[PDB]
């Protein structure tokens, strides 16, 4: 498993202190589009090994963090660069859509 399973307590260390790119997924279990991008995120974790880390924060189990980033709709994917959000994607997307988004914003 290449994915970081975040908590509200671990966010600072896992995301804000990490030396590189973290793709954070803000999601919930009852959220249909959230569950659709889940296996895509697994594949991307594999594909982007050494370029970025994928991390997931479930917003019901960890209610404190989303509001700090003004998250309303889910899924919301935030690409962090050394603790600094670089890019925002709200809603579901295919692997092809995520690849382009990542390639364009990792540059």
Active site residues: 31, 34
| Token couple for 7 | 């908590």
Q: Mapping DSSP to helix (H, G, I), strand (E, B) and coil, where does residue 20 land?
A: coil
Buried b (16+ CB within 10 A) or exposed e, 90-104: eebbeeeebbebbee
What's the distance, Cα to Cα, between the start and end of the chain in Å? Answer: 25
What Cα–Cα distance (Å) separates residue 4 from each residue in 58, 65, 104? 12, 15, 23
């Amino acid at each position: 498993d290449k994915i970081i399973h975040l908590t509200d307590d671990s966010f600072d260390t896992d995301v804000l202190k990490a030396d590189g790119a973290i793709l954070v997924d803000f999601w919930a279990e009852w959220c249909g589009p959230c569950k659709m991008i889940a296996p895509i995120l697994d594949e991307i974790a594999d594909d982007y090994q050494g370029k970025l880390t994928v991390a997931k924060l479930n917003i019901d189990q960890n209610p404190g963090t989303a509001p700090k980033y003004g998250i309303r709709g889910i899924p919301t994917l935030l690409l962090f660069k050394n603790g600094e959000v670089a890019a925002t994607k709200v809603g579901a997307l295919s692997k092809g859509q995520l690849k382009e988004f990542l390639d364009a914003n990792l540059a």
